[PDB]
Amino acid sequence: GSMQSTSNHLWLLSDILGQGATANVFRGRHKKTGDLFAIKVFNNRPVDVQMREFEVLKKLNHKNIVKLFAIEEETTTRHKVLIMEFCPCGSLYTVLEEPSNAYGLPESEFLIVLRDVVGGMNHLRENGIVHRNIKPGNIMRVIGEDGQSVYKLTDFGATVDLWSIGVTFYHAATGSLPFRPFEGPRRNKEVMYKIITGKPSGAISGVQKAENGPIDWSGDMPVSCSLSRGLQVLLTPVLANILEADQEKCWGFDQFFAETSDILHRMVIHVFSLQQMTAHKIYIHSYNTATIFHELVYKQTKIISSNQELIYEGRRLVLEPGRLAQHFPKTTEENPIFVVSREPLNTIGLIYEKISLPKVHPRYDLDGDASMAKAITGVVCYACRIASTLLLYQELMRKGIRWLIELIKDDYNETVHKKTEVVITLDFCIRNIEKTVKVAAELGEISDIHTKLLRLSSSQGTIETSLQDIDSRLSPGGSLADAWAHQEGTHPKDRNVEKLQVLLNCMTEIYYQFKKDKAERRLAYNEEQIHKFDKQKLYYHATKAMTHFTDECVKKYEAFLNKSEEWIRKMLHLRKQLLSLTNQCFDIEEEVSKYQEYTNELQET
Amino acid sequence: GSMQSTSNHLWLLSDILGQGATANVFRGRHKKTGDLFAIKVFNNRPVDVQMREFEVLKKLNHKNIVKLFAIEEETTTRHKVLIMEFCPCGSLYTVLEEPSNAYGLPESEFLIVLRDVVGGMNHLRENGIVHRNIKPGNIMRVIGEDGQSVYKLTDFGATVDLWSIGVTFYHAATGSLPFRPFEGPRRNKEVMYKIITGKPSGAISGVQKAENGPIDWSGDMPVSCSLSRGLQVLLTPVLANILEADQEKCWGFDQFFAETSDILHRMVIHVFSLQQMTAHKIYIHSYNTATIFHELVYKQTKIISSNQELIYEGRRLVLEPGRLAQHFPKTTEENPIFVVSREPLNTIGLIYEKISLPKVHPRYDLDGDASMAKAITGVVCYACRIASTLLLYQELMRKGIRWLIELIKDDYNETVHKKTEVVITLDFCIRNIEKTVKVAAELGEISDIHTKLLRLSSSQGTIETSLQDIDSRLSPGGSLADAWAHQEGTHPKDRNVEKLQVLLNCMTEIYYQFKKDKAERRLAYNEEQIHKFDKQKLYYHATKAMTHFTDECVKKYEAFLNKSEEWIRKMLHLRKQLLSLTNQCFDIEEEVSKYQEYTNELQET
Ligand SMILES: O=C(NCCCNc1nc(Nc2cccc(NC(=O)N3CCCC3)c2)ncc1I)c1cccs1
Ligand SMILES: O=C(NCCCNc1nc(Nc2cccc(NC(=O)N3CCCC3)c2)ncc1I)c1cccs1
Ligand SMILES: [Cl-]
Ligand SMILES: [Cl-]
Ligand SMILES: [Hg+2]
Ligand SMILES: [Hg+2]
Ligand SMILES: [Hg+2]
Ligand SMILES: [Hg+2]
Ligand SMILES: [Hg+2]
Ligand SMILES: [Hg+2]
Ligand SMILES: [Hg+2]
Ligand SMILES: [Hg+2]
Ligand SMILES: [Hg+2]
Ligand SMILES: [Hg+2]
């Protein structure tokens, strides 16, 4: 267990972090403090041409650049080593190897990557440096003091740069590479070049699904992408315009910097479309107006501004058109603004990818098994993520529905008040006919003023019985009852996700062990069997979860969804009937407000 | 690396799980399946007296009992070994060694322990077995298929049993033993016996704070206990009555079983006292009434039933007195029922223990350092837990306040409607005087009917200007504005807990490493220094957090609290003024409803 060293540092050779053709990178410590540092060792241009170039890099001080502290000579050989900032978490590759990131990073995490990569790039540019090969392996992750990832660039030895940035982001967004010959790019270097050159403009992906088969191009992100629609719509054009073949038509940096900053500077407002059963993230600038917001909601919901009715924390939200977004109420995915419309809409629900388990190859193979373990574990994470979202959609629906009924009831109580505000006036100016009567053209005139008036009271008896009928429907036994939502679908107390997470955790441990078993080239007899046992356990665990997922989570969800679609239908019919009833109270009120002063007479002297 | 074995199982001797004077327990595998099992090996009563006793235990099938599968003979010696259910998570001791449990288990986790221990005990009793020594080391934890802990009893070879159960529960509830001589019970066996025998009845703890110093007795749980007040009030009497010295006065099992089942059968309703700034868990039976609920709230809040005003999801909650608790709205700690009162109450806020860091002993000592690492890490977890709760209290306050203003506004709109419901009637029966007038005891009579009536309209001008004044205070610029709550205290976006958690995680890793360093009796030169380095890092991390905790989390919280206390004061004054104004509209309404038919005259023929 020998180790090399320098005056200030030392490191086991076993503790290697990275290996390149030019150099190796190990994890060592400062001899005097014990502090962890990354050691970059060159095993090996004239000597002082380098002493100069070392100084300028030493000057680089930036958040999204791995810090170069010092340059030392190893002790046994004089070859140059680099003492660099150690990143305990690893790299973006490490992250992307996580099964829970098998279908892309969470949106929140993705945004940190975007931010930090871009800031690092610009700093390089601001100093004239070019990073010929950006890639997930170049991008280190560290935990910031606030618990948030901070990403930092390393290993740099400009349109060409935009390409590898593009591939990385697609990879980061989806967990997969955008350009995939069958089996592998390496396996099919030739198929890959045709794909990249023959890529039609605007396209962001190209997939060969069969051997020597055609390429499925797409301008859209896969369904399995976790990024919100709001973001996909913004992200997509950037990729399309930096993944352009003819460099004649490339976008350029300043434009690139502007378009990404415009995204990064946007805040997110969480919106839930109650009639479509769809959650939405609205990406909007602080200084954009509510008018623009409504337009943005329409783009994702197809609800025109005039039809957009807003609900927040159990009550209506009325936005001044020109109200800036930074002054809006605080929202989360869990606490969104609900949108409803008085116009019928198709109930969509959650759209997700139907993904089945890959087959498990019985042939014992350390490299194959570890690769397989990742894929099968990745699906369940996705399945677990979908299960969570389905529940969220149901929980939000249930909350929103509860709130809307109370809102309608407010309207109902508002209108009942109005009726009782015009009954009173009407009664007084009719009971004041008779009282004044008991004080034949006159009588011929008054009967009209009476009969016609008595028709209004008669018209209100027809309203009264109809409101009581709406009240009847809003009551617990009413046909618009809430009870069903708690009888249908799934609830937190079912703990289906936790039930799935237990299975995922057993599977994830085995995956990591298989990952370990791979690095050790050969197993002992016993360890060989255990690998084969746990291989079978993997499939058993995956099969149980999927059965549970489809039979329990999805099935009960679709039943809840079908009941909602019809229940919505009822709600819309009621509001329309109430509105008609509301307007009649207004029509009556103004007809009564003319016969109130219908006091006309002319008198002698 | 030799290993023993039997026909069906084998196990490394290095992989030991437990060690007793009679036997050792190792973790092994089934030879044919590879499945993990606990192996209990006896190194060593007549032979078949045992073959019989083995069969009855083999029959025991229970959820809270570790399963005994089979009994085999080791291969090299014929001494008897036991194949038992392996519990991957470990024991309650393991759990209690976690720094985040240094001050007791989370309430939810504690309840699973209570449930599972009791069910296991009863099963033993139901079969006549006695478990002479229950203890945290006897109690194994496994993850249930729903992600919830399942606890299972093992290693059994009845008032006396209630004692060790009692100590365990106090230990589980607080993270500490109830009876503690200075330094240690073992260290002071003699001081301990005096404490246990000389313990005054009713007491649940006894602590010697100085060497040869007195004992601080307590009948209450420590402030640092995480259990809700609702539970403490229920748990305390059980402990007091099973920690009784004179076994003459012990409680007995049937009573014990009844009292605990009565607790376990209770559901929890989350309540937040908005005026006291205190969260509460109400432990109530499904079949108990709202009447009883209100009584239960009074016990924790001192708000009498009549004064209890309920709010849920932004709107008033009106409970039928006899409404059963199982039909109540769903609550969480995050989504509680808010309680308010029209009567002044002292603002309490969160009550927690002020705990400072222990001193770190510079003397390198593997046993001492590991013990110290736990304590100092335990405090920060507690500090982290308090930070989270303080934020929760602030977030809930902010939400509740937002809701209450809207509720008052509903009242305000309800009353404005009423005014406009009695103005209309009043106007009609006054404008109908004049209109009827233009058709001297009579005139002498009417002026009264006019003047007195005109006083009511004059009285309503005084109301109108006063309501507009209340409206003025409820508006954004109003003196009862919300804005301050977002300017004061702390918010989720500050990420103070996450900032603290980062520090806690660095500290926790070192603790676990120190725990590892202890087990290995001696360190190499390098490993020796690193232990000393990380020892210093521990203190540095702890000091930074505490500074951040006191200066940032607590300080801003207390400012928010002080502003709330005064803001509440304003709110109460307004509701009282509104009520007075509301009642005047009622007083006026009935005085106007008498002069409406004040139409009296007698006529010839
Ligand atoms: O590849 C290269 N350069 C960039 C990479 C090497 N450089 C650094 N690497 C780290 N850190 C690091 C790296 C890898 C893995 C990990 N961590 C893990 O894998 N973990 C963590 C426990 C979970 C597993 C951490 N820090 C600072 C630096 I500078 C090069 C190749 C050739 C020349 S340069
Ligand atoms: O002490 C005794 N009897 C009860 C205890 C031994 N019996 C069992 N013990 C386990 N499991 C187990 C135990 C200890 C530790 C752990 N796990 C850990 O420490 N972990 C997990 C990784 C985190 C660290 C698991 N299962 C099943 C059984 I039966 C006895 C002493 C003498 C006679 S009997
Ligand atoms: Cl590097
Ligand atoms: Cl045991
Ligand atoms: Hg990490
Ligand atoms: Hg996942
Ligand atoms: Hg998940
Ligand atoms: Hg009139
Ligand atoms: Hg596992
Ligand atoms: Hg565990
Ligand atoms: Hg904690
Ligand atoms: Hg915490
Ligand atoms: Hg009248
Ligand atoms: Hg650490």
UniProtKB/Swiss-Prot annotation, chains A, B:
Changing residue 537 to D: Decreases phosphorylation and kinase activity. Changing residue 525 to A: Decreases kinase activity. Reduced phosphorylation of STING1. The active site is at 133 (proton acceptor). Changing residue 274 to E: Decreases kinase activity. No effect on phosphorylation. Changing residue 481 to T: No effect on IFNB induction. Residues 267-343 form the Ubiquitin-like domain. Changing residue 456 to I: No effect on IFNB induction. Phosphorylation requires homodimerization and ubiquitination at Lys-32 and Lys-359. (Microbial infection) Interaction with SARS-CoV-2 M protein induces 'Lys-48'-linked ubiquitination which leads to proteasomal degradation. The keyword Coiled coil applies. Residues 365-605 form a coiled coil. It comes from the Eukaryota. Ubiquitous with higher expression in testis. Expressed in the ganglion cells, nerve fiber layer and microvasculature of the retina. Changing residue 507 to R: In FTDALS4; loss of kinase activity. There is a cross-link at residues 32, 359 (Glycyl lysine isopeptide (Lys-Gly) (interchain with G-Cter in ubiquitin)). Changing residue 283 to E: Abolishes phosphorylation and kinase activity. One of its GO terms (molecular function) is protein kinase activity. Residues 11-268 form the Protein kinase domain. It is linked to Glaucoma 1, open angle, P: A form of primary open angle glaucoma (POAG). POAG is characterized by a specific pattern of optic nerve and visual field defects. The angle of the anterior chamber of the eye is open, and usually the intraocular pressure is increased. However, glaucoma can occur at any intraocular pressure. The disease is generally asymptomatic until the late stages, by which time significant and irreversible optic nerve damage has already taken place. GLC1P is characterized by early onset, thin central corneas and low intraocular pressure. PANTHER family: IKB KINASE, SERINE_THREONINE-PROTEIN KINASE TBK1. This is Serine/threonine-protein kinase TBK1. It comes from Homo sapiens.
